[PDB]
Every structure is written in structure tokens, then in C-alpha cells.
Amino acid sequence: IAHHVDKGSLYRLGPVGINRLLNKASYNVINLSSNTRSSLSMNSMLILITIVSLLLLVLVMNVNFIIVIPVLISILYILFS
Amino acid sequence: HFHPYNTLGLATQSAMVGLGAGVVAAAARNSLATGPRNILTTFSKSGGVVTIFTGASIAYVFTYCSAANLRERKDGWNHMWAGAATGAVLGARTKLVPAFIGWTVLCGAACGLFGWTGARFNADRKASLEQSPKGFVQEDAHQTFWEVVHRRPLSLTVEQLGEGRGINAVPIATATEAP
Amino acid sequence: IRASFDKAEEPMLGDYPDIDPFPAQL
Amino acid sequence: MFLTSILLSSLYLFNRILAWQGNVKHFYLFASNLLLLFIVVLYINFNTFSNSFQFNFELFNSLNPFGLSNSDISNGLLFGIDGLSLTFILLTVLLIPLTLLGNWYNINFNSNLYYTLVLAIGLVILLNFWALDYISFYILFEATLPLLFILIHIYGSSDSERASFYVLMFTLSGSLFMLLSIVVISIVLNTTNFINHNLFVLSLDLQTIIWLGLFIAIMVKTPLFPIHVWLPVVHSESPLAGSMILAGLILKLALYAILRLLLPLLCEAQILYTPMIYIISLLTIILTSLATLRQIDLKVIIAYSSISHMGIAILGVCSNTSLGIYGSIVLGVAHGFVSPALFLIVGGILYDRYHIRIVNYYKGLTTYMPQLATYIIILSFANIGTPLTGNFTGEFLSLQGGFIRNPIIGGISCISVLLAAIYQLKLTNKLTGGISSIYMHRTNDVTIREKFIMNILIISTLIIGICPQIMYNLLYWTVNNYIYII
Amino acid sequence: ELKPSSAIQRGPLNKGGWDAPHALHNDGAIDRYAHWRTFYQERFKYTRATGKSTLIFLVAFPALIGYVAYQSEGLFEFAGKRRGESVTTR
Amino acid sequence: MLILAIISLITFVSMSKLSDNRAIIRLINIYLILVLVLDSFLYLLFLNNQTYTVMGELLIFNSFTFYIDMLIYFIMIVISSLYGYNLYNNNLYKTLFEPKKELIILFLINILGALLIVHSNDFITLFVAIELQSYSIYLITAIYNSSYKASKASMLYFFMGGILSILIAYSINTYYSVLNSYTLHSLDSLIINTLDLNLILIALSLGLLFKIGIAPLHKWLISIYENTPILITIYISLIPKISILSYLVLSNISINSLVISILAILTLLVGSVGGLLQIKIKRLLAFSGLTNAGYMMLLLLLNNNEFSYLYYITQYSISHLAIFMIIIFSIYYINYINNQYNPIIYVNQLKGLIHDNAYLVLSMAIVVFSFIGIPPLLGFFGKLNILMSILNNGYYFISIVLIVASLISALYYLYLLNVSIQDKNNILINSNETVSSVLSYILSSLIILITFGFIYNSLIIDIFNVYFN
Amino acid sequence: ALFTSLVGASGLGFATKFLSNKIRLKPAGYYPLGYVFSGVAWAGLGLVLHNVHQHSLEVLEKKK
Numbered sequence A: 001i002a003h004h005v006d007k008g009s010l011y012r013l014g015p016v017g018i019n020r021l022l023n024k025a026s027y028n029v030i031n032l033s034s035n036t037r038s039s040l041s042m043n044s045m046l047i048l049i050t051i052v053s054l055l056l057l058v059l060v061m062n063v064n065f066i067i068v069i070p071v072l073i074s075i076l077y078i079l080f081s
Numbered sequence B: 001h002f003h004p005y006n007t008l009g010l011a012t013q014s015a016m017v018g019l020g021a022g023v024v025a026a027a028a029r030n031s032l033a034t035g036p037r038n039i040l041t042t043f044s045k046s047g048g049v050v051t052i053f054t055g056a057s058i059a060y061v062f063t064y065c066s067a068a069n070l071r072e073r074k075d076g077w078n079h080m081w082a083g084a085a086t087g088a089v090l091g092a093r094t095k096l097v098p099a100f101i102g103w104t105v106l107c108g109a110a111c112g113l114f115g116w117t118g119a120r121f122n123a124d125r126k127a128s129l130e131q132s133p134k135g136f137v138q139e140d141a142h143q144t145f146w147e148v149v150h151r152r153p154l155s156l157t158v159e160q161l162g163e164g165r166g167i168n169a170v171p172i173a174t175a176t177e178a179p
Numbered sequence C: 001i002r003a004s005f006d007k008a009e010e011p012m013l014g015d016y017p018d019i020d021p022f023p024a025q026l
Numbered sequence D: 001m002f003l004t005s006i007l008l009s010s011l012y013l014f015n016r017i018l019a020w021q022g023n024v025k026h027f028y029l030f031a032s033n034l035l036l037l038f039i040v041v042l043y044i045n046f047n048t049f050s051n052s053f054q055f056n057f058e059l060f061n062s063l064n065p066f067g068l069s070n071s072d073i074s075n076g077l078l079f080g081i082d083g084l085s086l087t088f089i090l091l092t093v094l095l096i097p098l099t100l101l102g103n104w105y106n107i108n109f110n111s112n113l114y115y116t117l118v119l120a121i122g123l124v125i126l127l128n129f130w131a132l133d134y135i136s137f138y139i140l141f142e143a144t145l146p147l148l149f150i151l152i153h154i155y156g157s158s159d160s161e162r163a164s165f166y167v168l169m170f171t172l173s174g175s176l177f178m179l180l181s182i183v184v185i186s187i188v189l190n191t192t193n194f195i196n197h198n199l200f201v202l203s204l205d206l207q208t209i210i211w212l213g214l215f216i217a218i219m220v221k222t223p224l225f226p227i228h229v230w231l232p233v234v235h236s237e238s239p240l241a242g243s244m245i246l247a248g249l250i251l252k253l254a255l256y257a258i259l260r261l262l263l264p265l266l267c268e269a270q271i272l273y274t275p276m277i278y279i280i281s282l283l284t285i286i287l288t289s290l291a292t293l294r295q296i297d298l299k300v301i302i303a304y305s306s307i308s309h310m311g312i313a314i315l316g317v318c319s320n321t322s323l324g325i326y327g328s329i330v331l332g333v334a335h336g337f338v339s340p341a342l343f344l345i346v347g348g349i350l351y352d353r354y355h356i357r358i359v360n361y362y363k364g365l366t367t368y369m370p371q372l373a374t375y376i377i378i379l380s381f382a383n384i385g386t387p388l389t390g391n392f393t394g395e396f397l398s399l400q401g402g403f404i405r406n407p408i409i410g411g412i413s414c415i416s417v418l419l420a421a422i423y424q425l426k427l428t429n430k431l432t433g434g435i436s437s438i439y440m441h442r443t444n445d446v447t448i449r450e451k452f453i454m455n456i457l458i459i460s461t462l463i464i465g466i467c468p469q470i471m472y473n474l475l476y477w478t479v480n481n482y483i484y485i486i
Numbered sequence E: 001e002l003k004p005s006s007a008i009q010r011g012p013l014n015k016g017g018w019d020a021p022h023a024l025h026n027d028g029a030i031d032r033y034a035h036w037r038t039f040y041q042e043r044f045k046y047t048r049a050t051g052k053s054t055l056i057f058l059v060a061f062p063a064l065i066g067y068v069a070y071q072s073e074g075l076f077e078f079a080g081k082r083r084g085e086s087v088t089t090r
Numbered sequence F: 001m002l003i004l005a006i007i008s009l010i011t012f013v014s015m016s017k018l019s020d021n022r023a024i025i026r027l028i029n030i031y032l033i034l035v036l037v038l039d040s041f042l043y044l045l046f047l048n049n050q051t052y053t054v055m056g057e058l059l060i061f062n063s064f065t066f067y068i069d070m071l072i073y074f075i076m077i078v079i080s081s082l083y084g085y086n087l088y089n090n091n092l093y094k095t096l097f098e099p100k101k102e103l104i105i106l107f108l109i110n111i112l113g114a115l116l117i118v119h120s121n122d123f124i125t126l127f128v129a130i131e132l133q134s135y136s137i138y139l140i141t142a143i144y145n146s147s148y149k150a151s152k153a154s155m156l157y158f159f160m161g162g163i164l165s166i167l168i169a170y171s172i173n174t175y176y177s178v179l180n181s182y183t184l185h186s187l188d189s190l191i192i193n194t195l196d197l198n199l200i201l202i203a204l205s206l207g208l209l210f211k212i213g214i215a216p217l218h219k220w221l222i223s224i225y226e227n228t229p230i231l232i233t234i235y236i237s238l239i240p241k242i243s244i245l246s247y248l249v250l251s252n253i254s255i256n257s258l259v260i261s262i263l264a265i266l267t268l269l270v271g272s273v274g275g276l277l278q279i280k281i282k283r284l285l286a287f288s289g290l291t292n293a294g295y296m297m298l299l300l301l302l303n304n305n306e307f308s309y310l311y312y313i314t315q316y317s318i319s320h321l322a323i324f325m326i327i328i329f330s331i332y333y334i335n336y337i338n339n340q341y342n343p344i345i346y347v348n349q350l351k352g353l354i355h356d357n358a359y360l361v362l363s364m365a366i367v368v369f370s371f372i373g374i375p376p377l378l379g380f381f382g383k384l385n386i387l388m389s390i391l392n393n394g395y396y397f398i399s400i401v402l403i404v405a406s407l408i409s410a411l412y413y414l415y416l417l418n419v420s421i422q423d424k425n426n427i428l429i430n431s432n433e434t435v436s437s438v439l440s441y442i443l444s445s446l447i448i449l450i451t452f453g454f455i456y457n458s459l460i461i462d463i464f465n466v467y468f469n
Numbered sequence G: 001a002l003f004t005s006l007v008g009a010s011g012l013g014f015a016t017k018f019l020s021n022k023i024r025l026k027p028a029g030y031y032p033l034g035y036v037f038s039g040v041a042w043a044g045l046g047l048v049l050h051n052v053h054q055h056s057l058e059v060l061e062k063k064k
């Protein structure tokens, strides 16, 4: 209990597992735009997707609501990991 | 009451949507990259994204409609079971078992917390203070949610709490009276 | 390493020397 | 004009003692000691015949922002006492000169910083118990956390970075949900108040889902089972004063807040949901008092001891019975005596002498410190719950009150007398007995100040243990103010 | 050509006070043992033993207490009593 | 009386030399002070939320707009009191932080462009005023021409602001195509039911919102903020945010907006987890700008957001302003100085600052606790009053993600303190020259507002009640 | 009361002058007339805010 529960698994849902979770998710949103020192072309091909992805997202929404939730979970997965 | 869901119909709609999301994400991954790339490496150096967008989109809504049909009601628990299935799909990319179990528990708990509040990113127009009856009641009205009264009816609290612990249908002193 | 709990702590140690546990009484 | 002149004189006296004397250890002692002379005279004029709140004042009213106010329209910050609210102030004010004393011959580097921080996080927990709004209770429920962060980070032993981050993070993370549940009942009722909310009922579907936001907020502060991650590893790297004032005062605050906030407007949401509180309190008593056995460090053991007694106490509050409420109050007033005395034993005396807190170096304390091994034993046997000490009166009444409400959970929870004896006596007979250790040069006997603290924290347990009725004159309304058994 | 100014004269930091002599000989084995035990969580991993303990004390044991506490809720009423009378409610 | 200043000073700066620039900025500072002192009795015009439409259905003058109109002059006095005044009287501190000749012109042209949006009714005043202020940011950025990063930053900001300006003009043109009028009150609550307007009104919103840092397009702004010099960026981080956010909040064109709710959540996620592993101080500071500008699309979803907004904006502007001025003080004590335009770059560089002076770290501690919402501080009631409106109007998952975002953000706010209270090994024993008197009195006043604004909280609520209802 | 509302804002002014001395690494009393300047300035701010609140209360009284 003092090693497999108190220090083992209640820190995985505590300050040890969340340190690694935030380390991974921060590293991915940092590396969103890593290379391509042409930052103008890199930010400019990003403005197009974020008026296309939203524009298809709303089309998918107003036919059925349930089929955008896995889309949004998968966008969080590709964005944060 | 409710209406059962077409599991196959909603699943194949979401399969088409996951297909389109995988295609537009692979098209995004080609162009937002570096090094030698062409038209054919759309699905060669794709990072396996179209499997993500396809499998999550099938498994969530299939488990959701199946859970809502076998429970015969709609609440936040169906989003918990569906988010557990989504965590099962997203956990299989890292081929390790305790990772996988953690994805299934935590993504399912996060999706259940999303489903319990209303399963909405926005608000409900009705059923919130600005558009719902609030404050005190005026007369012997059924106290709705958002409202306060001064004394609840005892026949209501015995139906809600129970007939056990200390709560009784008659208060204890007048139950023990001299006549 | 003799007991089943001493075996169950092999993957935790990384720089610990992992010596043989022997009773102080015996 | 008169009370302004008192302040303009006292700040000048403070300035001149800053100028001539170097430390303000003496003036902080003088001020914190005069707080006793003030609060005891407040206790004299306390009418015990009234359930009523006696001494009321609003700060920060509209018509008078800098001071007192007598208007027919009140939007300031209310303050007052009765009974319940007053026993914990009297617990507080006789302890804060002892933590202010507790690091007297110790600090040596920026002492004026340290004693300012300790006195300030004592005054903030005075005004915790004076407060009467939900916001004025809450705006001092975390005015502690800045000064606690900086008192752990600077002046912490070693690896005090991580402990300081934990005392901010865990408390804040559980505290924001308390803020949510305060916001909800401040937009429904439009009143933050501790006087009127007996009158206001709520829908059971509303009352159900705002009890969560306060319960998993006190789950962090009195550390119950998915929490108490942070409790031992904020203790084990704290300094001496910020460990005594943590374990004697910050923990009993949520014992006070489950009474003050939860029980009298959540009356119908609890009786559905007390048998989750019994689950969580039992498997903190069963689990956290069993992980004490395997602990290499010496301050971490007394940390988990604090967890186990605070897990006994909140199954006396949540009993909805009449003996358990008073039993949990006498637990809160007696654990706040016996426990900071133990922190004076572990990181107080023994870390000042040898500066390392591993248990494995420490045996044979009797042969060169006899009149410390006495304070090891009588203070341990006071922590276990031998009678005539005031811990047993609380443990007894709280196990009895938790036996009324559900007898199977009380029968299982009665094993805590055993489980609290095991680790405490295992520690006591490792420290007390054996040949005086190899690693250990013989250092001084326990000195006059570290006896003067101890005998106060021992007599104040023994008086409660011989007569627990010396504070029934305060509490006999608050034994009734929280029962909903119709 | 960007240097903090010539008008600083900055010195060393002392903590001040008395060098207390060493009352303890530190043991390297006990020190590295304790440093291994306190920071145990940075190297903990999931095995079959870890998973067995986590299955029991986090899942099965709260569920058993939950069954016992929510079923036996308002049964027992041992306040007075007599002979032959009902000891429970249900 | 901006243009009475601008027309006069442009002739005055045309003839003055390069040495006179400091004293020109001092003159303009004192001028703005006396415009705030002798002319601030115009609050009496409204007494019951009375709104005036001036220049013929073209400008709109109400009291929300009067408060923003007063807030911008106050922060401009604090900004202009930086360029006017020397930090120290040394060789380094003259060659650092040099104001250009045309800088003081471009500030007030930007304030004209920022005020003519909050006061704006027509779409053409909207478009001309976003253009005026966008040019002024193009040129406040590029005025330090002999800097490599600043020129690259101005050229990036140019094309991204150009795309979002054409997206706004497309939305304005499209609303004109479906309804003949340009004014927003041609809506008057009967259109929106019988008319699909949701796509137009969101594209008008998203056009301004993406100019500010709405988080799918957050990567370019962080790069511009890290690349400009450390004094251009306090101004160009404060001004366009507050100007258009009080526009979009005064005219509630996107209620219940699902796109706005998603991007609000995405902002609160990626800001609080983007600032976590970052070693540059202006970065950390700009993502603290991002999460706090994402407690804004939230109130933009609401109806009746004028206590929560205004209180949180003046909270944020004081707190923002104070922590930039703290690191501008902190550059004297650091051991390494690179990059003349941007002297402190890393948050590793301000170590051991408590051993240099303790009261600048006392100041830094109260501001960093005010960002994370610590209850006796003024920054707490801002989040409290956002949450008394989020939960008031039905946004429950928004509230939970708001809380989790605040907790993840506090982890990189407190890194500033973790760095600044540590042992340094090289303590200062005697500084020969001392920092400028007025420029440290300004920071002391901005602290004591933060630490003692709960005193006057109650007066503000009563005043508010009279003057907006 | 008006008087305590002046004295408290003047005390805020004394705190501004004190903390501005302490950032500049000066002693507490450095330019002890500057305390009078800051006290009068912040007390004048208390005058202003006090009178605005008075007039706002009277406007609310006239609506009945």
C-alpha cells in the first residue's frame, strides 16, 4: 500500500502522471510549427485549414450532433499528441 | 419517451465523416511538413492519421448507440461507455497494456464528465437562470429546480430520502402522545 | 530475492545495487 | 479619531522597535501574546445562553469602506462568533505564540521575514473563524496559500521546491471546486451569509450537485482517500512553525467548514449521501494508518497519524447524531494540542540536534536523554488514545456516533484503536530503547523553551482528558444546530 | 559593449552564524537507501504485483464497502429493546 | 482631444531634433494626464445607461465605451511615462530603450484607431478604424528598423493582418448583401429568428478574433511578441486586444455560438498547456496573454457582460502592465545582457532576484498571484465574476474547462517565483545610482491597486448599478 | 462616514510612497514631504470617489 498504492498509483493520478501528461501534450503543441523557417508560408497555410476545418465541422454538425464528438476527440489527439 | 438508434446507419455516417477527416488531415500533413514529399506520400508518410479519424469515429458512436439502446434511456453514462471505446481505439496505437487501460479509463471519465453536464459545448437556452423560473415560489406551487421555498412537504421528503434513518412520516414526539 | 515481494521490485530499481536480503538475526 | 490615533501610535512604536532593536521576535511575541488577553476577555463577555451571534462587525461596506458600518443596506464582509466558532479561536490563539516561540534560537538568516510570515498565516486563520459570508470565509481560506508557498519554499529543509508546489497546487485544485459551489449558491440565493441559510431550502436535484463541489473540496483539505498524496510530503520538507500551524490549524479548518458550510443548508443532500462519506472515511482509517508501518522518515509518520485522526473525526460530524458532533470538536481541539508537540519532537528538537530525519539512525535515546524519552512516551501514549488525555474522549464519542448511523461501518472502524497503536508504539520503542547509537554524538538535554512548549501542550490535553466538559458551555447549541433526524 | 554597470561592487553571500560541529556521521548506504525510498514514485512501473494491489485496494475494497454501506442503511435500530421484537427494519 | 494633440505634435516633432524626443514624450504624457483630470466629468451625461449616437448613426457613445475610452488614456500615460523617463542615468541605459522620432506620433494614431472601434456603430467606421490601428501596429513594430527580428516580425504581421482584414471586409459585404443596412441595430431581434445570420455574424466575429490570438491561429502572434523589442510589445499586446474585445462585447452578435464555444475551449487548452515548457520570458508572458484573452470569447458568448468584462479588463491591464514593468526593472540586476533591443530574453536569467532586492520580488509575487486568482487580490474577483456569468447562463462544461485551464496555467505563472526566490552567489551590496523616482512610483501605485482593490469593490458595484442600468 | 474614507485613502498613499522608496533601495523615510504629497493626492482620489458614490445614491433615491 505504501509503495504500490500510496506512492505508486495515487501519484499516477496525482502529481507524477500529470507531469508526464503535460510534458507530452506541451511538447506536441510546441512542435506544431517546428521547422519551415519560412514562417510566413507556415502561418499562411495554417490560416486556410482553420477556415476549412471549421467550415466542414459545422456541416457535419447540423446533420447530426453525435458525429462531431469523435472528430473533436481526434483533433485533440492529433493536436496534443 | 425515447426512440432507439440506428446503430448501423449512424455508424456508417460517422465512418464517412471519419474518412473525410482522415483525408483532409493527410492533405494538411503533406503541406505542413519538410523534406522531399510528393502526391503519393499523402498515405505513405501519413503518420497513420486516417486510421485514427476512422476508428475513433466508428467506435464512439457504435458503442454510444448500443449502450443507449440496451439501457433504454439517455443520460451521461452513454457518453462514458462511448468515451471508453474511443480510449480503446486511441490506446492501441501505443502497443502497451497499462497505457491502454489508462486511456480507456481516463478518456471514458472525461467523456462521461462531458456527457453528464448536458453533452454540449454551448449552453441550453432554456433551463438556466436567465430563462427559467427562479427565486421563491408564490403559492403552494410544485417547487421546480432553481427555486427556493421555506418548508418542503414531508410527504415529498419521505418519498425522496426514505423511511429509515431518522426521517419518518410523523415527527417522533407527536407520534408518542398521551391519548 | 528469496521472497515473492523482493522479486516484485526488480523493475523499479535503476541504480540501486540490488543486494541479497538476509535476516539480521540469522 | 481615537482608534485612528491608537493605530498611528502603535505603528510608530513598531517603527522604533524596528530601528533600535534588530529583530521583531519580541514585538511579535508581545502582540500575539496580547491577542490572548483580548480573546479571553471576549470569552468572558460571551453570553452562553443564546444560540445567537454575539460580536458582529461588517468590514468594507459601501457607505464606509475603511471601517465599521451601521446601515440598513449591507454588502460588505460580515464577521462574528458563537460557540463552535469560538472554541477553535481559543485553540488558535494559545498556539500561535508557541509556533512563534518554536523557532526562537533557530533561524539566523532573514528572521524578520520568517516571523512575519508565521504571524500572518496565524492571523489569517483567526479571521477564518471570525468570517460569516461564503466569500468572506473563502477570501481567507486561501489568503494562507501565498505565505504558505513562500514559507515552505524559502526556509524549507531540502527538496522544498516540490513541497511548496504541492501546498499551492493540491489545495488550490480542490479549492476551485469550492469556489464553483459557492458561485452557484450565490446566484441562486443572492445571499452569502451564515445566518439565514437555515431558512433556504433548495431542490434535491440542485442540493445534490452542489454538495459535490464542497465535499471534494474538503476531501483535499482534510486529506481523504484520492488525496493525501500531498500531506506527508508537505510536512516532511516544511520548517518547524509551518508544520505545527499546518497540522494543528489548517486541518481543523475543514472540520469547521463541514459544519459551517455543508450540514445546515445541505440537509437533505447528505442523508442520501452519507454512506459515501463512510466509505471514504473508513478506507482512510484502514489504508492510511496501514501505510504508516513502512516509513523510513520520521516526520512522515506523524503526518499520516494526522490523516488517521482527521479521518476518525469526519465520521463523527457526518453522523447526524448528537454525540458525534461534540466528539469531533473535542478531537479537533485535542489533536491540535498533541500533534504539534509531536512535530516539536521530530523536526523540532531532533532535527535541530542532528539535521537528518531518517529513522534508522535513531536508537537508544534514553541513556543520554532521559527527560526526552519521557516526552516521547507520554506524548505517544497520548496520541494512541489512552483515556484521560482528550484524544480518547474524541475517538470514543466519534466512533460511537459513527456506530449509531451505520453500525457495521462503526464496528469495522473501531479497529482504529489497534491501528493507531501499532505504528506509534513501533516508533516509540525504536526511538526509546536499545544501546545508544553509533552514529550519534551525545548532544544537549532538551532545553527550557522546548520544555515550556511541551508541558503546555501536555497539560492542555490532560485537562480535556480529565474534564471534557470545560467546553460544553460553548458547544451545547451547536450539538443541536446540525441534526436533521426530524 | 553591453555590460552591467561599473557601479555595483557586488559581493559574496553568507548565511551568517556559527559552524556547528558534526554530531552525526552520515552513512552512505542509509543515505542512498532513503533517497531511493522517498523518490520511489519517479521509477515506479506497472507489473502484475502492482496491478494486483491497485485492483484490490482502489477498486474491489471500496466496492465491497459500498455494498455493505448502501445495503445496510437504515436496518438496525438498537435504541431500547425487548425480547422477540424486531431487531432490524426491513 | 486626441487630434488636437496629434495635429499639433506632428508639426512640433517635424522641427525638433533627435535629442528632443524624450522631452516631447514627457509633454504628451502630462497632456494626457490633464485631459483625464480636467475633462473626466463627462460621466454625468449618462445616468441610466443613456447612449448617444453622434455624427449621424455613425459613432455610438454610451458608458461602457466611456469606461474603455478612459482606460486607454490611463494605460497610455503609464506607457508614455516609460519612454519619457530614464531608467538609470548610465551609458547602457541611454543606448538601450531609445525612442524613435516618429514613435510618439504612431502611439496616438493607434489610440485614435482603437477608440474609433469601441465608439463605432457603422461598419464603415469599424473598417476604417481597424485599418488605422492595423497600420499603426505595422509601423510601431517596424520603427526599430535596425533589428533583424523586428523587421521580420513586422513583415509577418503585415500579411496575417491583411488576410484577416479581407475576411472582415468580406463578412461586412456579405451582411450588406443579405440586408440593405450596415448598422447592427437593423437586427433589432426580429431579423435573427426569421433569417439565417449565424454564418455571417460568426465570420465577422472570427475575423477580428483571429487578429487577436484565437488559438487555431495563435502561433504567429507569439512569434511577433517574442520578436519585437520589449517595450513595443507591452503596447502592441495591450491595445488591439482590449479595443476589439470591447467592440465584440458591446455588440452581442454571436450568442450561443458553437464555433465560439469550441474556440474558447481550444484557447483555454492550448494556452495553458503551451506555456508549460517554455524558457523565454516574453513567450511565457504572451501565453499568459493568450489564456486571459480566452476568458473573453466566453463573455462574448454571453448576454449582458458588462460587469464581468470591464472589471476583468481593468484587472488584466493593470496586471499585464505591472509585470512587464517588473522585468524592465529586473534587467539591471542580471549578469548577462544580450540583444540591445530585447535585453532579458530568458526566465532563467532573473534568478536570485530576492537577494538583489526583496521588494521587487514582493511586487512580482503579488502580481503573479493576481494572475492565478488568489482571493485577497484584485485578480481573483475577475475570475469570480466571469464564473458568476458563465454558470448564470448555462455553460457548465465551459466552467469545468475554465477551472482546469486556470490550474494548468498557474503552473507556469509560479515558475517566475520559483526562479526569482533562489540563491544567486553574487549579491549586490551597494548600488551607486538609483532608479528613477516617478517610474518606480508608478509601479508602486499599480501594485497597491492590485493588492487593495477589494476595498473599493463594493463602491464599484453600487456605482456600476446606477450608471449602467 | 467621509472622514475614515479620507484617512484610509491617505494610508494607501503612505503605502505608495513607502513601497516606492523600498524599490529604489532607499530607507523608509527618505523624502518625508513626499508622504504628504502622496497622502494628499490619494486622499483627493478618495474625495472624488466618495462624491461620485453620494450622487449615485441620490439618483437611486429619486426613482421612487
Ligand SMILES: CCCCCCCCCCC(CCCCCCCCCC)(CO[C@H]1O[C@@H](CO)[C@H](O[C@@H]2O[C@@H](CO)[C@H](O)[C@@H](O)[C@@H]2O)[C@@H](O)[C@@H]1O)CO[C@H]1O[C@@H](CO)[C@H](O[C@@H]2O[C@@H](CO)[C@H](O)[C@@H](O)[C@@H]2O)[C@@H](O)[C@H]1O
Pocket (backbone or CB within 6 Å): B074, B075, B076, B077, B115, B116, B117, B118, B119, B127, B128, B132, B143, B144, B145, B146, D177, D180, D181, D184, D203, D205, D209, D210, D212, D213, F396, F397, F399, F400
Ligand atoms: C460542482 C462540481 C459538480 C459538477 C456538476 C455539473 C453537472 C450538473 C448537471 C445537472 C443539470 C444542470 C444543473 C447545474 C446547476 C449547477 C452546476 C454546478 C457547477 C457546474 C460545473 C444538467 O442536466 C443535464 O443532465 C444530463 C444527464 O444527467 C442530461 O444528459 C443528456 O440527456 C439527454 C436529454 O435529456 C440528451 O439527449 C443526452 O445526449 C445527454 O446525455 C441532460 O438532459 C440534462 O440537461 C440539470 O439541469 C436541468 O435539470 C432538470 C432537472 O433534472 C430541470 O428541469 C426540471 O423539470 C422537472 C423535473 O422535476 C421540474 O419541473 C423541475 O425540477 C425542473 O423544471 C432543468 O431546469 C434543468 O436545469
Ligand SMILES: CCCCC/C=C\C/C=C\CCCCCCCC(=O)O[C@H](COC(=O)CCCCCCCCCCCCCCC)COP(=O)([O-])OCC[N+](C)(C)C
Pocket (backbone or CB within 6 Å): F036, F037, F040, F041, F043, F067, F074, F306, F307, F310, F311, F314, F315, F378, F449, F452, F453, F454, F456, F457, F460, F463, F464, F467, G009, G041, G042, G044, G045, G046, G048, G049, G052
Ligand atoms: C487627482 C488625480 C491625480 C492623478 C491620477 C491620475 C489617474 C488616476 C486614475 C485612476 C485611479 C483609480 C480610479 C478608479 C475609478 C473607478 C471608477 C469606476 O468604478 O467606474 C465605474 C464602473 O466601473 C466598472 O464598471 C468596473 C471597473 C472595476 C475597477 C476594478 C479595479 C478597481 C479597484 C481599484 C480602483 C479604485 C481605487 C481607488 C483608489 C483611491 C463607472 O463610474 P464612473 O465612470 O462615473 O467613474 C469615474 C468618475 N470619475 C471620472 C470622476 C472618476
